């Protein structure tokens, strides 16, 4: 199917509390496989999925070299952005970056990504063409110039169209029994009365993978979009996800409302009613 | 595998 590889970087300045901290996490779809944290006594890349533990010491030694380059680089990038915005050397600032590639169902580079943020706001992003940049303000236009001069988009296009895609495929084959095996959710409805007139009907979904799921409460056919209390998909802590949707319905009307569960691991979209 | 080229902003 449709798969992706993403790397998430976080570079924090901490005046007086040491040198900037750089952290990196890697993902194959919704599964984390690597981590790096410059704050460690012995900073080195560490596995966070079993299907990566098989990689040799050269692989880990290679990743650590890359993440050590980024620790040195982001210390300089944090000073420059502080200078662009005329910020004091006492404040703490954050540079975030998320980059990676998408494979289509046909298994070829679908689209590549490279986005950077400053203090939680868009800063600079690589455009869909993988040639040009979108800069958020005039400060990001200074970075844009530096990156145009250094031909960073050209570098990224080679990585995204090649090594990103080649290594993603490798991770998908080495971890096929978990990465290419979709987990269907575990559905069940619960009745919890809030008042004598009204009662809450929660539609639960547990132990599914990937995190993409669509839960809809339909009152005799029409979707109760404004009226449904939907919560954010949460991690179970064992590579799987959870999600629920609750509707406060009148005590007795419990059979007029139906919950539709849409997922990759399901053969057909489920329809659920409350079971007394 | 992460990108092994980094340019200061």
């Amino acid at each position: 199917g449709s798969h992706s590889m993403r790397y998430f970087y976080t570079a924090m300045s901490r005046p007086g509390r040491g040198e900037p901290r750089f952290i990196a996490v890697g993902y194959v779809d919704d599964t984390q496989f690597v981590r790096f944290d410059s704050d460690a006594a012995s900073p080195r890349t560490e596995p966070r999925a079993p299907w990566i533990e098989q990689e040799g010491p050269e692989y880990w030694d290679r990743n650590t070299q890359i993440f050590k380059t980024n620790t040195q680089t982001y210390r300089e990038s944090l000073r420059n952005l502080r200078g662009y915005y005329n910020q004091s050397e006492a404040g703490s600032h954050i540079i975030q970056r998320m980059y990676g590639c998408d494979l289509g169902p046909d298994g070829r580079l679908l689209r590549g990504h490279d986005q950077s943020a400053y203090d939680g706001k868009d800063y600079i992003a690589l455009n869909e063409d993988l040639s040009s940049w979108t800069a958020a303000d005039t400060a990001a236009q200074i970075t844009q110039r530096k990156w145009e001069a250094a031909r960073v988009a050209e570098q990224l296009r080679a990585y995204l169209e090649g090594l990103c895609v080649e290594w993603l495929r490798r991770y998908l084959e080495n971890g096929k029994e978990t990465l290419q095996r979709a987990d269907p959710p575990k559905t069940h409805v619960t009745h919890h009365p809030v008042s004598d007139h009204e009662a809450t009907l929660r539609c639960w979904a547990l132990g599914f993978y990937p995190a993409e799921i669509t839960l809809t409460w339909q009152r005799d056919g029409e979707d109760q979009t404004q009226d449904t209390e939907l919560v954010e998909t949460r991690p179970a802590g064992d590579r799987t996800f959870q999600k629920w949707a609750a509707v406060v319905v009148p005590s007795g009307e419990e059979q007029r409302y139906t919950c539709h569960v849409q997922h990759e691991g399901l053969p057909k979209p489920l329809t659920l009613r409350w079971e007394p | 595998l992460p990108f092994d080229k980094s340019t200061i902003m």
Partner: T-cell receptor, first 114, second 116 residues
Framework: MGENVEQHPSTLSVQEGDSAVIKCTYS??????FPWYKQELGKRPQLIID?????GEKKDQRIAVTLNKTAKHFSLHITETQPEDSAVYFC????????????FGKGTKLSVIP | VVSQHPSRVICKSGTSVKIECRSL??????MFWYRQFPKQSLMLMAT?????????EQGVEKDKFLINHASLTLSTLTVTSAHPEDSSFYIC?????????????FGPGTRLTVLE
């Protein structure tokens, strides 16, 4: 440091107006950047053209570079040679393990006989 | 663009000659030092890392060639107690991209002539 770039030929004589071809080979697969430098007598090496692993050919007027990442060899093609093209040409690759560096070829002395 | 200073040096044997390598319009975390004798090849001597110790190539005397990576813009090469065999063309390179070496820009080079 795990990359070896071999440049062939060591010397080249071509007639003004004819075409010159320099071939290079690389060892490491971590090589994704391949620059070409031209160095005139007593002067600095100047970047003339380069190619990346996602491109097979790149052309700039008379200068052209070819890449075959399967056989691990890349080439420089100068068409309609001018006597000003006479210089030492170096090719490089960014691959290898350990310490990061450009691994350069030993050089090609191009002599465009007018 | 990358530059050097001095461009040409004539000195007596036993003197230490300091050569600068400067990235005039960008910041460089790494600078490379080469030696070029009349044999045409570019011989990498050392890799200057900010603000780490220089990496020397095989058969390069770490004590004869002192490399200091002072700032994100300057690297100096010192030919300590230079002898006539140290007469060579010392050229440097730097590029705006850190990590796996990308586009490198060369300095004009330094022609060192050591005479007894």
């Amino acid at each position: 440091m795990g990359e070896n770039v071999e440049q062939h030929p060591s010397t080249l004589s071509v007639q003004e107006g004819d075409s010159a071809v320099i071939k290079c080979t690389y060892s490491d697969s971590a090589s994704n950047y391949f620059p070409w430098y031209k160095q005139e007598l007593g002067k600095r090496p100047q970047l003339i053209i380069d190619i990346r692993s996602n491109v097979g050919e790149k052309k700039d007027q008379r200068i052209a570079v070819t890449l075959n990442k399967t056989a691990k060899h890349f080439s420089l093609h100068i068409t309609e040679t001018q006597p000003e093209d006479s210089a030492v040409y170096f090719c490089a690759a960014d691959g290898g393990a350990g310490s990061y560096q450009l691994t350069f070829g030993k050089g090609t002395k191009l002599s465009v006989i007018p | 663009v990358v530059s050097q200073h001095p461009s040409r040096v004539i000195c007596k044997s036993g003197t230490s000659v300091k050569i600068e390598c400067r990235s005039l319009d960008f910041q460089a975390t790494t600078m490379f030092w080469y030696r070029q004798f009349p044999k045409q090849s570019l011989m990498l001597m050392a890799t200057s890392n900010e603000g780490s110790k220089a990496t020397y190539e095989q058969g390069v005397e770490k004590d004869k060639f002192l490399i200091n990576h002072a700032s994100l813009t300057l690297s100096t090469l010192t030919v300590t107690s230079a002898h006539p065999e140290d007469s060579s063309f010392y050229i440097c390179s730097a590029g705006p991209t850190s990590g796996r070496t990308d586009t490198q820009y060369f300095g004009p080079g330094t022609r060192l002539t050591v005479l007894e």
